[PDB]
Structures are given as C-alpha cells and as structure tokens.
C-alpha cells in the first residue's frame, strides 16, 4: 500500500504535455508574447490533465535516446501544426504590405532596401483584422482539437515517418504568395490603371508631374479603394483558414 507509482504517472503526463506545449509556443494567438509564460504553461498542463488518462501510457525511460527521439517527434508535430496555421496570417500580411507599398507609403525601400526605415502599417492593420477574424471563427479551439486528434493518426509511441510530406509544408510557402496576389489583385490593378493614367499626364508637357501630383492622389485613392475592399477579406479569410486546415489534415497523416 501507499505505492503511488510515480514513473507511470510521469510517463503518462509527460509526452502529451510536450506535444501540447510545443503547439502552444508556436500556434498563433496562443504563442503571442503578451500572454504571461505561466498562463501558457498552466493551459498546457490542464489540457494534458484532461487528455492524458484516456491515452495508452508509454513506458520508455526518460534516460534513453528513445526519450530524445520521442521529444523530437512531439516538438516537430507541434511546430508543424503551429507554423502551418501561421502561414495564413503570413499571406494576409504579404497582401497588406503590397497594397501599402503600391500606396507609396514607404518609398525608401526602393532606394535603400532594408535600411531600418520601413512601416508596413496596412500590413499590420490587416494582420490584426485577420487575428480578430480568426478569434471570431474559433480557429484556436479547432487547433487544440486537431492537436488532440493527431494522436489517433500518429500515436505518442515512436512511429516511422515519410518525406515529400515535409515538402508539402514547405510547398505551402507558395500559398502565402499565391493567395496574397489575389487579395491585392482586387485593388492593385485599379491602382495600376491610376498609375497608367498618371503616365498619360506625363506624356504631356515634360516634368511638372509625378512626385508632386501623383502621390497624394494615389494615396487617397488607395485609401478609399481598400476601405471599400475591407468587406472582401472575410470570405477570403475563411478560404485561407479552410485551405490551411485541410492541408494540415491531409499531410499530417
């Protein structure tokens, strides 16, 4: 009596904690530095407390290279999930920064690339709008649910792994660009026409145009254009989230 076998409880509560905390430190909104560290640790601990008793406990000792392989596996799974989720916000940031750069908002990058003078304020605006939308669509709950679900697909125990699968996540790097182009497209094109229009004005009497009349007009036009274009991101926001989620579901397995 008075056994309280500690190794069994430790091995039951450790690896799910490692995977949950690995997701927490990288998953969007759950990985933002504004949350105190203890809150994140407690959330991981409580989620593991809820989940672990149902799972089959592992018996590999913590003092073995098998434990290191397990820890590497959990870290890989968590960071892969969090990063694949982060790709959508990366795409939204790209689209916003490009709309802002076609605004002429930061012209110093065309002359001094990476010269400590850059303000992608539109990128930040649409990034926080995307975060608000993600909060509204309860994406984080889904993330937690999928973190739990990847066990049935991929159990804690060391399992063999595949290859092109990693490429898929890396190939998801294309989406950030590909979807970004579309969001812009609904505005950059008209801005392009505006610039074309300015060109027609410069084909008249030489000089006396551009850098004096083009910038304010194009700034105001970009502002009101994409202010009107704001209602458009939400369907595209859901499209981006669905793309990331089903890509994750297909490739994680």
């Amino acid at each position: 009596v008075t056994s309280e076998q500690w190794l069994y409880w430790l091995h039951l509560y450790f690896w799910p904690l490692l995977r949950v905390l690995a997701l927490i430190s990288t998953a969007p909104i759950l990985s933002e530095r504004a949350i105190p560290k203890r809150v994140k640790l407690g959330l991981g601990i409580m989620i593991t407390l809820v989940i672990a008793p149902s799972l089959p406990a592992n018996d590999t000792p913590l003092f073995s290279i098998a434990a290191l392989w397990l820890a590497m596996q959990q870290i890989l799974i968590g960071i892969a999930l969090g990063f694949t989720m982060q790709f959508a916000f990366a795409a939204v940031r790209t689209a916003g920064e490009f709309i802002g750069l076609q605004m002429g908002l930061s012209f110093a990058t065309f002359v001094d690339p990476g010269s400590h003078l850059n303000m992608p304020v539109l990128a930040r605006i649409m990034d926080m709008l995307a975060m608000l939308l993600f909060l509204t669509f309860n994406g984080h709950l889904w993330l937690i649910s999928l973190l739990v679900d990847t066990f049935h697909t991929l159990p804690i125990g060391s399992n063999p792994v595949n290859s092109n699968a990693f490429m898929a996540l890396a190939r998801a790097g294309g989406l950030i660009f590909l979807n970004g182009l579309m969001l812009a497209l609904p505005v950059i094109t008209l801005l392009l026409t505006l610039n074309l229009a300015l060109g027609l004005l410069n084909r008249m009497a030489p000089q006396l145009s551009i850098f004096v009349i083009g910038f304010p007009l194009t700034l105001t036009v970009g502002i009101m254009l994409m202010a009107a274009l704001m209602p458009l991101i939400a369907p595209f926001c859901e499209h981006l989230f669905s793309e990331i989620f089903n890509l994750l579901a297909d490739i994680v397995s």
Binding site: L133, T136, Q207, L208, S209, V212, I223, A227, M230, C237
Partner: protein, 89 residues
C-alpha cells in the same frame, strides 16, 4: 462578435482615417496641380518650386480644419472605448 461586426469595425475605422487625411491630402494635391499647370503655362520647369507652396498650404490646413479633426478623432476613440464591453466574445 460576428465577423460582420468585425469587418464593419475595420471599415468605419478606416473611413475615419480617410476623413482625417482627406483635407490635407486634397489640399496638397490641389496646390501641386495648380503650380504644375502654372509651370506648363509659363514654360517654367524646376522640380523644387512646386515643393514650396505645398508646405504652406498643408500647414494652413491644420490651422483651419485642425479642431474639426481633433474633435472627430476623440469622439471616435471615446465611442470605441465606451462600446468596447458590448462587442466582447
């Protein structure tokens, strides 16, 4: 809470930004266009004389319409902070 409310939040915010920035940008644009057409009429071309009246015009713009902008933006922020605890989810 609903995404319709969020996107409305962004729209109204950025229309407030547009209203705040439109007088200054429009005044600068009008001054630049006027100076450019005068240069074209007089056949004078130096890229620096268009920069001179623009600053004066835009700075006068704050003299005339500045209180209106300051009152509009404060009202927007006040209303947003007051309605903050009713759009919580």
């Amino acid at each position: 809470m609903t995404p319709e409310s969020v996107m409305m939040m962004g729209t109204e915010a950025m229309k407030v930004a547009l209203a705040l920035a439109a007088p200054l940008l429009l005044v600068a644009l009008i001054t630049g266009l006027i100076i450019s057409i005068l240069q074209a009429a007089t056949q004078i071309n130096e890229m620096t004389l268009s920069f001179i009246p623009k600053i004066v015009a835009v700075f006068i713009a704050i003299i005339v319409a500045g209180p209106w902008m300051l009152n509009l933006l404060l009202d927007y922020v006040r209303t947003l902070f007051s309605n903050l605890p009713y759009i919580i989810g």
